[PDB]
């Protein structure tokens, strides 16, 4: 019977990095979803499992709002069956995805003049991520045959990389803020409907 906190996720002051992506569990709320169709601020709005237009007439058990920031070239990879550095090492989506993917450009926010290097992404990992997995491991990646005992160097690489987010980069290399909505429903009581 209360208002839904969706406004916190999209209008958040700061956004998390790709590998350490945030996740807001939402329950006991009511959302209309109309503010998401009508706003022309989103450069990409891809729902997969459900028709978003006929959503406020439905109800779900739990809706999860993932949020992070990626590069423009990576926005295509947030989708089922996708393959790439972001999809395999940072954030993977299941093939039977019942949700939506929203992305909008944020080069005016997440960009220092000399380059905002505070946004990171995992470029090294020895096994592809399972769907909805979240990896914070700082363990040094072992690329060569000789073991790396916590010391980096040749064939011993730090597993995280920094996005160079200058405002002079092309649209391909610009920060995009991404939100991923996931709708799940067991035979448990559904607690998030619409009007």
């Amino acid at each position, epitope marked *: 019977t209360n208002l839904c906190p969706f406004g916190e996720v999209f209008n958040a002051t700061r956004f998390a990095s790709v590998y350490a992506w945030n996740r807001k569990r939402i329950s006991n709320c009511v959302a209309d979803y109309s503010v998401l*169709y009508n706003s022309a601020s989103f450069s990409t709005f*891809k729902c997969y499992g459900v028709s978003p237009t006929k959503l406020n007439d439905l109800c779900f058990t739990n809706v999860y709002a993932d949020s992070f920031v990626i590069r423009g070239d990576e926005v295509r990879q947030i989708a089922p069956g996708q393959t790439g550095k972001i999809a395999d090492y940072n954030y993977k989506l299941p093939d039977d995805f019942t949700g939506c993917v929203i992305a909008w450009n944020s080069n005016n926010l997440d960009s220092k003049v000399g380059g905002n290097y505070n946004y990171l992404y995992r470029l090294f990992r020895k096994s592809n991520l399972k769907p909805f997995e979240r990896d914070i491991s700082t363990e040094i990646y072992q690329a060569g045959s000789t073991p790396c005992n916590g010391v980096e160097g040749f064939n011993c690489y730090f597993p995280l990389q920094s996005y160079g987010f200058q405002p002079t980069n092309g649209v391909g290399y610009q920060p995009y803020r991404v939100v991923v909505l996931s709708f799940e429903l067991l035979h448990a009581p559904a607690t998030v409907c619409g009007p």
Partner: antibody
Framework: QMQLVQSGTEVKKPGESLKISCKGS????????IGWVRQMPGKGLEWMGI????????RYSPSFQGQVTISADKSINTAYLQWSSLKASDTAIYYC????????????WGQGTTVTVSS | DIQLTQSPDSLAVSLGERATINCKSS????????????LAWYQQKPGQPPKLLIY???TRESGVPDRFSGSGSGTDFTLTISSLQAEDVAVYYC?????????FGQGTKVEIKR
């Protein structure tokens, strides 16, 4: 609620190119995927392909792969379906349908574009 | 990929009587996450474009009168018109939206029996 509007009736000779359009008016268009359906005279519905305007993700049916070309223009909210060389067997009516998601039923339909190919 | 087969091709029922159309699938269409089968029923009148009647095989589009109902599960689905009226003479199709490529049914021609 938004709606779709297609181009006018076309009558071409065998061998000419053709590119019909389908523009959607109304708010809430960013979410809609647009698909093309072919209906031959007196025959059933045939799903040709689907496209997304935001990033031009295009998925063909196996029966129409390499036979047609589906394109988009997000600046004007218009999807396109084109032939390079029309055949007499392409004479049909082509609807454009719209679903607000990729794995979503086609909620909104166009009026249809009747294409006649004959010598 | 997925195949859909309807039955019957033509169906004639009197006014006010019940009309039944069956749609069989060559593959289970059930999104495991939410337990909603991705099956849809469309209506197409002569000269008209198709019109969506039922989605998720039991949920009905807004404005559709209370005489249309969808049922079924697994690979067997049914469309039922309770009180057949004159304005319902049309061709009815079933369509799956589990995975691309989308596929339609063969279509059922429904006329009035007199």
């Amino acid at each position: 609620q938004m709606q779709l509007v297609q181009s006018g009736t076309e009558v071409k000779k065998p061998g000419e190119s053709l590119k019909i359009s389908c523009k959607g008016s109304g708010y809430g268009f960013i979410t809609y995927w647009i698909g093309w359906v072919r209906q031959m005279p007196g025959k059933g519905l045939e799903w040709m392909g689907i496209i997304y305007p935001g990033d031009s993700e295009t998925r063909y049916s196996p029966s129409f792969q390499g036979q047609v070309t589906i394109s988009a223009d997000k600046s004007i909210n218009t999807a396109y379906l084109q032939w390079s060389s029309l055949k007499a067997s392409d004479t049909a009516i082509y609807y454009c349908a719209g679903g607000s998601g990729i794995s979503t039923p086609m909620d909104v339909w166009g009026q249809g574009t009747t294409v006649t190919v004959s010598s | 990929d997925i195949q859909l087969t309807q039955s019957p091709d033509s169906l004639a029922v009197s006014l006010g009587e019940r009309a039944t159309i069956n749609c069989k699938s060559s593959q289970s269409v059930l999104y495991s996450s939410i337990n909603k089968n991705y099956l849809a029923w469309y209506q197409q009148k002569p000269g008209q474009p198709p019109k969506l009647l039922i989605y998720w095989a039991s949920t009905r589009e807004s404005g559709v009168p209370d005489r249309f109902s969808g049922s079924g599960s697994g690979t067997d689905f049914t469309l039922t018109i309770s009180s057949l009226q004159a304005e319902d003479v049309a061709v009815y199709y079933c369509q799956q939206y589990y995975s691309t490529p989308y596929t339609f049914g063969q279509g059922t021609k429904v006329e009035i029996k007199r």
